[PDB]
């Protein structure tokens, strides 16, 4: 056979730290994008999808060196490499308790009219959060010990730095490894081959290898925004309720339901303001473009990403698509409910009847409707007919306004390494994208970006009390980003840095080239 000095069984629990979507061929009559299922119909991570997740990350770690990658992941064409030395099995996903798959609604909002673009209405089945699956990894070593690149990979898994599945920038795909175990079998020797057959291997202390190494986390900037809703903030639930027509969106977060602001939603509002800034400077209109064309404007194509779209340039064929360097994570409330407490609200039928206990229960104030309704408040609304007054026939509707729901910080993740690759390594080309992002954050802090449903209709205004910029391995001129800002107008960043960004920003405004074309 292939010689194996030592075989390693590497295993542990991978937890969805955000929702997850590995897609099958697509579409189950309940979702336009349907989760991948094994032959038993169980939700699973294809070992292909995890192998490429871990190989892909390793490719960025190792500066896209083909040699060491193919040394561990095999190669079809080298005459001495062939099959992979890392085996990745298919891993079934255990959704916590037996929580069902969530369906997540999606819409594209026309940048001219500010409303749902026609056709751009979709839904994605997503694995909840808290869901667990096995890390099914085996490594056949021909060298002695365990590769540094493979130790670095396992460090990134425990750091939660690898992302899996679809929609990685739009909320999804974060996994974390826990309870990593290493079993070693010296298949080169009699005692180790029999141990493979009988004894389940020598346990290695991961903490020993974890001490021998420093985790080489790639360049990234992380933005964490602390917001409290000023006006109620909520994404609309997928369909009208009984006692309340318009209910907040919830997600399963372990064994409990929490109010969620999808990262798809925070990313679309940030993208919308980012694009509006760019178009405002260039005085570039969006009314004649269709929605896919409206999205495709400079700097946001790199930051927020662009659709895959192969185009013949001239003989050469180029993908216009790139993943977003900017990734936003779903936001969740401080406020959780048991999965049935919320069903008590969704299935309430009378606003002054059984809804009152349901909200008293779910808010945690079973005996204070006043305190309960300072958290979740039902609001009736009328359309008033313009000749008669009174109310228009049929136009009576109710919102469950989460007036006092408290939220977790919004967490944005800028892959500086991904941007730098788009800019072909040129760290000087980062400054306009950074300048744009800080301008978008200045607007977010100044209440210029409302979030969620009903922003024009009494909801969606947020107060931003802190923004914490916390990058790692940033290029030396971007290091003044490492700041906790509390002034909305960025004046906590050093003026010499804000002037340097402003200079590069103004240089780009003067000639707004496609900054990743070279």
């Amino acid at each position: 056979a292939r010689k194996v000095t030592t075989r390693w069984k590497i295993t542990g629990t991978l937890i969805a730290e955000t929702p997850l979507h590995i897609g099958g061929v697509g579409g189950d009559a309940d979702t336009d994008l349907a989760l991948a299922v094994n032959g038993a119909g169980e939700y699973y991570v294809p070992g292909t999808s995890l192998a490429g997740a871990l190989r892909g990350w390793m490719t960025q770690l190792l500066n896209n060196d083909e040699s060491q990658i193919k040394d561990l992941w095999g190669d079809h064409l080298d005459a001495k490499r062939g099959a992979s030395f890392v085996i990745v099995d298919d891993a079934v996903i255990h959704i916590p308790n037996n929580a069902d798959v969530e369906i997540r609604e999606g819409v594209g909002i026309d940048r001219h009219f500010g409303t749902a673009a026609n056709g751009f209405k979709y839904s994605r089945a997503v694995i909840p959060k808290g869901s667990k699956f096995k890390l099914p990894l085996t490594f056949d070593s021909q060298d002695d010990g365990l590769p540094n690149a493979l130790i670095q990979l396992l460090c990134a898994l425990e750091a939660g730095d690898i992302r899996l599945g679809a929609a990685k920038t739009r909320g999804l795909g974060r996994i974390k490894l826990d309870d990593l175990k290493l079993k070693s079998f010296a298949l080169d020797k009699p005692e180790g081959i029999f141990s493979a057959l009988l004894d389940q291997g020598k346990k290695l202390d991961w903490n020993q290898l974890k001490a021998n190494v420093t985790y080489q986390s790639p360049p990234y900037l992380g933005i964490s925004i602390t917001w409290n809703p000023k006006d109620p903030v909520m994404v609309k639930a997928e369909g009208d309720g009984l006692a309340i027509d318009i209910l907040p969106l919830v997600s399963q977060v372990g064994s409990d339901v929490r109010f969620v602001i999808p990262g798809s939603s925070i990313k679309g509002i940030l993208r919308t303001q980012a694009e509006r800034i760019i178009r405002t400077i260039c005085q570039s209109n969006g009314s004649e473009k269709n929605f896919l064309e409206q999205l495709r404007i400079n700097l946001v194509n790199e930051l927020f990403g662009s659709a895959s779209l192969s185009q013949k340039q001239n003989g050469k064929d180029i993908d216009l698509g790139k993943i977003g360097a900017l990734a936003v994570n779903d936001c969740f409330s401080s406020l959780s409910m048991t999965p049935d407490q919320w069903k008590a609200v969704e299935n309430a039928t009378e606003m002054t009847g059984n809804l009152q206990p349901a909200l008293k229960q779910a808010t945690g104030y079973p005996n204070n409707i006043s305190q309960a309704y300072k958290v979740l408040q039902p609001a009736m609304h009328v359309a008033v007919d313009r000749w008669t007054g009174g109310a228009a026939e049929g136009m009576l509707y109710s919102v469950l306004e989460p007036i006092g729901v408290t939220w977790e910080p919004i967490q944005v993740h800028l892959d500086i390494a991904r941007l730098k690759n788009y800019y072909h390594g040129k760290e000087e080309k980062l400054k306009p994208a950074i300048a744009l992002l800080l301008l978008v954050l200045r607007d977010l802090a100044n209440k210029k970006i409302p979030v969620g449903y009903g922003t024009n209709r009494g909801m969606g205004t947020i107060t931003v009390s802190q923004i914490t910029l916390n990058g790692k391995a940033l290029p030396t001129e971007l290091e003044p980003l490492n700041k906790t800002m509390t002034c909305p107008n960025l004046t906590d960043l050093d003026e010499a840095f804000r002037q340097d960004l402003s200079t590069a920003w103004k240089e780009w405004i003067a000639d707004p080239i496609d900054l990743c074309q070279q």
Partner: protein, 768 residues
């Protein structure tokens, strides 16, 4: 010997065996004769060998050649295609034969004729390659692969033909290695490294006790014993042959594909469409060699085993006579009309004929009034690879890929064993029930130990001797085997004049070629056969002759032919190596005298069955996709949408508005089970209790009650779908349970399809 099995439990979805894809698939798994997925015995041998190579490589302390690698070459045989230079020892064959792992026989029977279910055993896995800098799908790199559902338990027959002298210690070494390498096997097939093909592989009777013995004893183990052939031993004690000749017809049925090498050229072996008798000489030595000296009988010419040719009309199909010519545009035996025996019929006006060149014709009497039945032998190409063990993928150094044509399973062939009365006396004096010993199951051919070659042999009753007619005017000859005359210089370059001289001498009659100018008189083709002799370890010489089917007819100029002698030559054959089946003649056959141009041709699984769980996964898949496809069809017509939900178009208008349908459809998303039909009935009563919302649904064809019914009458979704689920179920009580299981999904699926087909028909009326 028999009794060992390999049990394979597939623990992840699995892909094997083929470099081809179907309509929506770019890689399709390999499928047995039942069209069911299976693990080919060459894949299973190769996988199990590799895992034994790992164990041996560990026991050798990582030495690539050593004591325990010798044991692998003992058990699995040497690999002479790798070794190079002057390797002196003859290559050992394997001690282990490993069949193909097939699905449970009763489960396989449940599938028969259920084409839709056979497809549901496997599904598309998506595959895409992502660009490392953009993080997006690469161009070109999008594939869809067929994968077979996990949970499949497959079993392969295994045979261990251990040497007779092998010690009990060495037996336990072989058991230990095989038990070890089986337990070390965790993957098989394609993309093993990326999830696929995870398995448990177990031998029957090799528990971990066999591994534990090896652990306790591996240090005491010597080199394997030296291999030697089972040589032949001749008693010499046979009687002289005495008439009559008994004829013992042997039916051969192929139970796995059989490779019978015609042309071995490069990386492909082409296959015969008949079994030569030489393949059965080993089975004759086994079963009968205890009764008489089979080797002396072969030497004396006291034994014939004919070729096993395809069974037609309950008899051995006869090689299509080359005197038959078809109309080149609109005739021949495959068309079933327009066949002329050019020995007797002139070529028609205008139409040019082509010779018949192959296949087998059935029986034909002198007044058949029909063309003879034509038997065709089904054969399939099987493709294999060799893996270079350090890169773990095929390479040019190992030859990459090779193919065998094989006669597929289920084919039925008839041979005849002919023996003189003196030997049949000898046998019957030693066993009166001796034809019962001719029932056997044997492996013949190329690659006979693994995936190929399994045949059942069954004897009939003693057949009648041939009855050639001693026509004094003309004699015809039909070749039913390949005639191997030697020239006068003992090489095989004989000519038709050598055959004329041969028959003239044998029958004591002078012959002359018939001169009728419109009629052909000789229709031979030559044949050259290249074969190996397993007892020589060298190829046979090359045997040149004329093909089966070759024909000729002579005018008998003087002398009188004896039907007793024609019969004798119709039993013993003429020329070289008639004991193997060469030389088989047909004399004065009707089909060569006749004129033909005017003629024409004429269960569900037991509920407790262990594969019931796995079968139920196949059922849901077949049901789900059936429901989906039918929902598409039903939604494609506006009359069926109005029947099922009352939804209709009124010009530009939709009844109700799409917003009202969206409200319903958003509630139906909550119909996960029939315990949630109260959710939809809650919505409908609230809708009905509000007058303005109820009026929104007037001018529907009673849509609110149609929705109430579909949600609350469990049979009604199935009435609308009207799928016949009998071709889609194999579990007993499958229909009742799957209807109870898939109800809510079927309701959701149909309404979703209807509302989509409604909106897209509305767009045709609305968008003008």
């Amino acid at each position: 010997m028999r009794g060992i099995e390999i049990t394979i439990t597939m623990q992840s979805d699995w892909h094997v065996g083929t470099g081809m894809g179907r309509g929506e698939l770019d890689s399709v798994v390999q499928r047995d004769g039942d069209n069911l997925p299976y693990i080919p015995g060459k894949t299973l041998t190769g996988i199990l060998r590799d895992s034994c190579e790992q164990v041996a490589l560990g026991l050798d302390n990582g030495q690539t050649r050593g004591l325990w690698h010798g044991w692998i070459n003992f058990i699995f045989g040497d690999q002479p295609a790798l070794a190079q230079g002057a390797i002196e020892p003859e290559p050992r064959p394997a001690l282990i034969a490993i069949g193909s792992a097939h699905l449970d026989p009763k489960l396989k029977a449940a599938f028969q004729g259920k084409k839709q279910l056979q497809e549901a055993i496997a599904f598309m896995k998506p595959g895409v390659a992502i660009d490392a800098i953009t993080g997006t799908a690469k161009k070109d790199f999008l594939r869809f692969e067929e994968v077979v559902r996990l949970g499949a338990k497959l079993t392969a027959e295994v045979e261990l033909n251990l040497p007779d002298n092998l010690s009990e210690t060495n037996k336990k070494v072989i058991a230990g290695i095989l038990a070890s390498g089986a337990k070390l096997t965790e993957r098989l097939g394609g993309k093993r490294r990326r999830g696929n093909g995870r398995c448990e592989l177990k031998f029957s009777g090799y528990s971990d006790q066999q591994i534990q013995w090896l652990k306790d004893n591996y240090q005491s183990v010597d080199q394997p014993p030296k291999y030697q052939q089972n040589k032949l031993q001749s008693a010499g004690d046979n009687p002289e042959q005495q008439p009559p000749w008994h004829i013992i017809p042997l039916t051969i049925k192929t139970l796995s594909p059989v490779v019978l090498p015609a042309r071995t050229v490069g990386n492909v072996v082409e296959c015969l469409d008949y079994i030569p008798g030489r393949y059965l000489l080993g089975y004759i030595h086994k079963t009968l060699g205890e009764y008489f000296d089979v080797s002396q009988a072969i030497a004396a010419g006291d034994l014939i085993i004919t070729n096993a040719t395809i069974k037609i009309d309950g008899k051995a199909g006869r090689a299509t006579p080359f005197c038959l010519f078809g109309e080149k545009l609109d005739g021949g035996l495959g068309k079933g009309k327009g066949v002329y025996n050019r020995f007797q019929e002139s070529e028609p006006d205008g139409i040019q004929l082509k010779g018949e060149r192959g296949g087998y014709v059935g029986q034909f009497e002198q007044e058949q009034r029909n063309l003879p039945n034509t038997g065709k032998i089904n054969s399939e190409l099987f493709t294999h690879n060799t893996i270079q063990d350090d890169v773990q993928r095929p390479t040019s150094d190992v030859g990459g890929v090779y193919s065998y044509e094989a006669i597929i399973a289920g084919q039925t062939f008839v041979a005849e064993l002919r023996l003189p009365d003196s030997l049949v006396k000898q046998i019957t004096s030693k066993n009166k029930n001796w034809q019962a010993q001719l029932k056997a199951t044997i492996r013949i051919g190329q690659s006979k130990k693994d995936q190929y070659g399994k045949i059942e042999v069954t004897s009939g009753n003693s057949a009648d001797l041939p009855k050639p007619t001693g026509n004094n005017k003309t004699l015809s000859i039909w070749f039913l085997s390949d005639i191997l005359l030697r020239g006068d210089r003992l090489n095989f370059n004989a000519t038709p004049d050598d055959l004329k001289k041969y028959l003239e001498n044998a029958l004591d009659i002078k012959l002359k070629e018939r001169s009728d100018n419109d009629l052909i008189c000789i229709a031979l083709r030559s044949q050259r056969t290249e074969s190996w002799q397993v007892r020589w370890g060298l190829p046979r010489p090359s045997l040149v002759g004329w093909q089966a089917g070759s024909c000729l007819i002579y005018d008998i100029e003087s002398g009188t032919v004896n039907a007793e002698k024609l019969q004798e030559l119709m039993i013993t054959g003429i020329g070289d190596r008639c004991t193997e089946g060469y030389g088989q003649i047909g004399f004065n056959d009707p089909l060569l005298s006749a004129s033909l141009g005017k003629l024409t041709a004429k269960n569900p699984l037991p509920t407790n069955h262990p594969t019931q769980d796995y079968a139920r996964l196949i059922e849901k898949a077949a049901w789900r996709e059936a429901i989906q496809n039918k929902a598409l069809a039903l939604a494609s017509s506006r009359a069926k949408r109005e029947e099922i939900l009352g939804i209709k178009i009124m010009g530009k208008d939709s009844q109700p508005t799409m917003t009202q349908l969206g409200g319903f459809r958003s509630v139906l998303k909550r119909l996960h089970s029939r315990n949630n039909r109260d959710i939809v009935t809650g919505y409908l009563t609230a809708l009905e209790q509000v007058s303005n919302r109820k009026e929104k649904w007037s001018n529907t064809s009673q849509g609110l009650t149609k929705i109430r019914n579909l949600v609350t009458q469990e049979n009604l979704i199935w009435n609308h779908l009207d799928i016949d689920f009998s071709p889609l179920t194999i579990t007993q009580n499958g229909v009742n349970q799957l209807k109870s299981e898939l109800w809510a999904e079927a309701v959701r699926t149909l309404v979703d399809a209807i509302i989509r087909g409604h909106k897209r028909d509305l767009e045709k009326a609305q968008e003008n």
